[PDB]
Amino acid sequence: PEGVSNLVGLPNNICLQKTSNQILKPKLISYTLPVTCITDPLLAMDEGYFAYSHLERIGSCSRGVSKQRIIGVGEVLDRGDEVPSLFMTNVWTPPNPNTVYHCSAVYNNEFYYVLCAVSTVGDPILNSTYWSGSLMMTRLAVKPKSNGGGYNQHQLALRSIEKGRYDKVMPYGPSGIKQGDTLYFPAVGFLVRTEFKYNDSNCPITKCQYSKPENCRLSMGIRPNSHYILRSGLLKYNLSDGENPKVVFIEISDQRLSIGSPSKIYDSLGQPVFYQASFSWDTMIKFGDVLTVNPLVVNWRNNTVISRPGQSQCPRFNTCPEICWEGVYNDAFLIDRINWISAGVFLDSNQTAENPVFTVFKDNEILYRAQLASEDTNAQKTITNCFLLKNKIWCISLVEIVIRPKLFAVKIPEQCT
Amino acid sequence: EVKLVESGGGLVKPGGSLKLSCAASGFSFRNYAMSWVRQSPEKRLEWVAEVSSGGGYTYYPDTVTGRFTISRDNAKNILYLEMSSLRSEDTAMYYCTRDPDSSGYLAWFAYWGQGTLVTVSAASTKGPSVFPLAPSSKSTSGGTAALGCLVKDYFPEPVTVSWNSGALTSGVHTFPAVLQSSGLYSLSSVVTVPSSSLGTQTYICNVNHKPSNTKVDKKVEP
Amino acid sequence: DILLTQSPASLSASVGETVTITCRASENINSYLAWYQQKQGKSPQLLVYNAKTLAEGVPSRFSGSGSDTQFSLKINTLQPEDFGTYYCQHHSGTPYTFGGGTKLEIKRTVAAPSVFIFPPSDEQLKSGTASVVCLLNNFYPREAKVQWKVDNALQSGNSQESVTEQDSKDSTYSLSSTLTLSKADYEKHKVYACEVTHQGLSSPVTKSF
Numbered sequence: 001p002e003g004v005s006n007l008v009g010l011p012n013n014i015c016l017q018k019t020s021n022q023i024l025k026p027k028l029i030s031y032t033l034p035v036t037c038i039t040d041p042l043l044a045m046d047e048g049y050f051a052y053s054h055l056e057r058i059g060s061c062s063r064g065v066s067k068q069r070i071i072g073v074g075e076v077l078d079r080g081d082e083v084p085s086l087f088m089t090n091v092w093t094p095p096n097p098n099t100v101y102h103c104s105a106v107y108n109n110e111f112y113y114v115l116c117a118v119s120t121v122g123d124p125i126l127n128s129t130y131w132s133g134s135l136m137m138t139r140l141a142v143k144p145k146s147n148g149g150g151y152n153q154h155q156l157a158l159r160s161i162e163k164g165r166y167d168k169v170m171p172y173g174p175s176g177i178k179q180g181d182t183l184y185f186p187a188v189g190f191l192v193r194t195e196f197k198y199n200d201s202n203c204p205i206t207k208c209q210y211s212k213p214e215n216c217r218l219s220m221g222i223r224p225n226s227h228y229i230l231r232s233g234l235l236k237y238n239l240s241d242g243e244n245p246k247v248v249f250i251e252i253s254d255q256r257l258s259i260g261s262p263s264k265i266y267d268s269l270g271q272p273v274f275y276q277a278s279f280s281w282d283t284m285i286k287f288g289d290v291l292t293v294n295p296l297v298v299n300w301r302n303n304t305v306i307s308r309p310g311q312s313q314c315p316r317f318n319t320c321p322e323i324c325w326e327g328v329y330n331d332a333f334l335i336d337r338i339n340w341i342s343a344g345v346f347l348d349s350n351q352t353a354e355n356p357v358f359t360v361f362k363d364n365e366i367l368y369r370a371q372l373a374s375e376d377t378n379a380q381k382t383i384t385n386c387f388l389l390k391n392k393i394w395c396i397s398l399v400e401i402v403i404r405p406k407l408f409a410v411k412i413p414e415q416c417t
Numbered sequence: 418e419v420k421l422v423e424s425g426g427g428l429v430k431p432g433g434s435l436k437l438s439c440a441a442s443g444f445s446f447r448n449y450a451m452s453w454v455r456q457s458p459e460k461r462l463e464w465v466a467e468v469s470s471g472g473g474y475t476y477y478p479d480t481v482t483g484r485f486t487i488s489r490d491n492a493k494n495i496l497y498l499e500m501s502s503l504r505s506e507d508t509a510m511y512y513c514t515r516d517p518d519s520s521g522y523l524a525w526f527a528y529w530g531q532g533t534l535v536t537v538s539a540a541s542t543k544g545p546s547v548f549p550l551a552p553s554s555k556s557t558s559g560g561t562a563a564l565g566c567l568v569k570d571y572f573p574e575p576v577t578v579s580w581n582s583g584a585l586t587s588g589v590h591t592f593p594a595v596l597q598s599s600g601l602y603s604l605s606s607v608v609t610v611p612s613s614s615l616g617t618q619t620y621i622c623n624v625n626h627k628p629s630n631t632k633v634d635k636k637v638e639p
Numbered sequence: 640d641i642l643l644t645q646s647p648a649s650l651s652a653s654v655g656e657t658v659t660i661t662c663r664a665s666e667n668i669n670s671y672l673a674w675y676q677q678k679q680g681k682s683p684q685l686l687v688y689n690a691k692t693l694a695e696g697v698p699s700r701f702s703g704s705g706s707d708t709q710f711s712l713k714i715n716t717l718q719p720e721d722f723g724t725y726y727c728q729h730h731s732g733t734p735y736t737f738g739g740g741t742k743l744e745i746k747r748t749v750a751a752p753s754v755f756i757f758p759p760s761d762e763q764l765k766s767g768t769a770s771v772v773c774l775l776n777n778f779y780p781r782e783a784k785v786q787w788k789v790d791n792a793l794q795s796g797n798s799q800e801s802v803t804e805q806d807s808k809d810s811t812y813s814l815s816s817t818l819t820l821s822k823a824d825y826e827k828h829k830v831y832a833c834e835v836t837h838q839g840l841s842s843p844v845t846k847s848f
């Protein structure tokens with residue numbers, strides 16, 4: 001195809017061997033987007049278009065005054081020298097920036113749809129027993145037209161929500177997928193703790209001498225006595241389900257179960273792939289091909305080399321079941337399915353979040369890496385999407401670094417020197 | 418809710434006879450005309466019989482005339498199709514259909530039953546052996562493991578495969594049957610599962626060959 | 640009689656694209672033309688009748704037009720569940736005749752198949768024949784070349800192929816191939832290989848035993 005295309009078919013060969021060579025040359029491409037403090041980044045990419053979101057806050061990046069929500073879409077052009085960049089095309093700013101949360105983006109047929117939570121009671125993850133179940137869904141034209149009216153920007157009607165045994169459902173991750181006319185956003189189900197069916201004998205504590213069988217069940221919520229547990233999953237939107245289609249929750253299977261965290265479903269090489277932040281004691285990266293979208297079943301990787309920084313209770317590389325809700329979202333994007341090679345930006349430090357490194361890896365072997373900064377520089381969230389330009393695998397990572405997001409374009413190299 | 422249910426289809430020797438029946442519910446049967454439509458093995462659709470609502474007026478193509486006879490019981494809400502002198506070229510799936518009005522003739526079919534399968538064949542019914550398709554460990558590309566059942570050497574169509582009595586559906590691929598050179602049908606039903614479930618979830622495939630009065634349940638084990 | 644001629648024979652279109660099928664009556668049939676969609680092993684489902692009238696609960700993305708001798712059906716905003724065979728029937732009077740059908744496949748991005756190879760079961764070997772089974776799982780396009788070689792010996796005429804019908808939600812096919820040989824010819828060889836050539840496989844993939 002022309003310009004930027006999804007990672008499908010038979011892409012140009014890539015370096016398939018472990019090498020300390022410096023063969024990844026990232027490129028700072030942030031300059032083609034908007035710059036106070038900036039948290040809650042969203043980067044979704046698909047079919048040559050992209051979606052971006054953030055909240056510009058006043059002073060403190062934790063509790064400052066919410067200045068603005070930016071929900072924006074655009075195209076991924078070859079910027080002029082065979083390097084891809086994001087060029088905004090259509091920006092929407094909610095009226096009330098501090099009632100919009102946990103936005104999640106999916107592209108379908110020259111529209112981005114973005115699913116957010118509406119809350120007048122704070123971050124629903126933190127005030128769940130008080131959060132109204134409400135959801136807002138915005139459709140943005142990726143390439144708006146002159147008097148485009150509703151085509152350019154439209155606020156779709158989120159009438160009904162089918163949620164099974166779940167009190168309330170919510171988007172929880174940057175990007176999702178489409179299958180035909182059905183959008184699957186990555187979501188989380190709030191379940192009353194007392195209905196949560198769990199076999200404590202399946203909490204894996206064999207080599208864990210200070211654990212106890214019931215930490216897993218306990219750290220399925222943000223406190224061990226938390227009113228809800230969070231189960232990750234899919235929110236399903238069927239665009240041909242009438243006037244106002246419903247959203248339907250799909251829970252993730254119980255295999256390698258961990259607290260609902262911010263997650264991501266993405267297509268790669270024709271088939272869907274899932275990623276779940278390790279916000280709990282299971283700190284080894286959770287991702288793998290989707291076996292089936294519904295029920296949601298994910299052939300998790302037995303990955304032994306990639307993890308996330310955490311706090312002192314569940315640090316990097318922790319495996320033992322512990323009571324903890326800590327960690328950062330550092331997603332990865334599968335670039336090669338035959339050999340299961342993937343790229344993402346992870347933070348190379350044990351209990352401090354710092355030193356972001358763009359990394360290409362196997363299940364139990366990092367192949368080649370490339371620091372995006374100095375070992376001192378604190379990073380928090382990383383979102384990585386990969387795609388084809390002139391048939392060459394590239395990746396765009398948003399890497400949080402006060403804190404503001406900065407975008408890197410890293411071409412996956414073919415030779416190993 | 419309109420419902421039509423065919424029944425009585427089967428294996429018949431070239432020259433024999435059969436009477437198919439269709440039960441109807443969900444609409445006032447007596448005021449509608451009805452029709453029988455069949456589908457050849459090559460999937461060409463072919464209309465066979467029309468009867469007025471009163472049952473006085475029956476219409477037929479040349480191809481089945483004087484061999485078939487459409488009839489109707491407005492008391493028990495049942496439509497019938499008496500077929501005789503059966504030829505190998507009437508081997509077809511047989512759907513009973515509702516007309517849009519009482520007298521028909523200019524009729525499309527908004528309602529069809531599930532069909533009933535008539536095989537006009539010299540051959541004799543033979544029930545199948547159902548074999549386990551073993552998941553190997555050479556299987557486990559990407560951590561998904563595949564298991565199934567081979568329903569082999571039977572006659573005539575159809576057989577039904579279930580898994581875990583209908584509990585297991587997603588992942589299942591019951592394939593069309595293939596006509597072996599020996600002249601019996603064979604089909605294969607597979608389901609793909611988390612390789613991690615292999616040791617801890619037993620998978621029982623439920624085959625049913627209604628003609629031969631077979632049902633087996635071969636448990637597939639690793 | 641009345642002859643309906645459907646064009647085209649078959650058809651492949653992407654989700655969202657608009658599709659159109661035409662049907663041509665041998666002789667004037669007014670607007671007495673009907674349209675059905677049929678998927679696998681199910682009674683055909685009435686879409687259009689009276690050339691232009693939609694049936695109950697048929698999506699409005701289905702339209703039909705025509706009169707006299709030429710008619711057509713339209714599906715705009717094609718949908719993954721719109722695969723099947725589409726037949727036209729005339730109801731201008733008896734005998735009713737249908738058209739040969741138009742086979743509609745949903746077009747999607749390429750998708751390489753998973754391959755699993757199944758060894759003949761002991762139960763089956765006690766009977767005196769062995770069938771080895773290969774499954775190509777959830778691939779697109781349909782077109783694959785499966786080959787059994789037995790001991791790097793290309794096999795032929797001892798194999799049969801059965802293809803799933805296109806999946807309703809993601810438009811993938813699946814394939815099983817059955818290599819069938821007697822318990823004697825099965826003793827005789829070492830390499831039992833399944834080889835799969837596909838658009839999304841740069842190199843043919845082989846599972847074997």
Ligand SMILES: *[C@@H]1O[C@H](CO)[C@@H](O)[C@H](O)[C@H]1NC(C)=O
Pocket residue numbers: 121122126127130
């Ligand atoms: C949750 O919302 C309720 C209702 O406004 C309030 O009483 C409570 O303080 C809130 N909790 C927070 C903001 O943590």
Ligand SMILES: *[C@@H]1O[C@H](CO)[C@@H](O)[C@H](O)[C@H]1NC(C)=O
Pocket residue numbers: 199200201202
């Ligand atoms: C939970 O799993 C263990 C592991 O076999 C088992 O012994 C225990 O009885 C299970 N409890 C249930 C199923 O209630």
Ligand SMILES: *[C@@H]1O[C@H](CO)[C@@H](O)[C@H](O)[C@H]1NC(C)=O
Pocket residue numbers: 182238239240241242720808
């Ligand atoms: C979307 O809706 C249509 C009709 O409502 C249905 O036929 C189709 O299967 C649905 N797709 C899903 C549920 O993925």
Ligand SMILES: *[C@@H]1O[C@H](CO)[C@@H](O)[C@H](O)[C@H]1NC(C)=O
Pocket residue numbers: 315316317318350
């Ligand atoms: C610190 O990093 C080392 C890597 O050399 C790792 O093996 C160790 O487990 C880490 N320590 C903690 C407490 O996580």
Ligand SMILES: *[C@@H]1O[C@H](CO)[C@@H](O)[C@H](O)[C@H]1NC(C)=O
Pocket residue numbers: 288299300301302557559560561612613
């Ligand atoms: C991961 O390991 C489990 C056993 O620990 C195995 O059953 C599963 O298939 C493996 N998954 C992958 C993708 O390798």
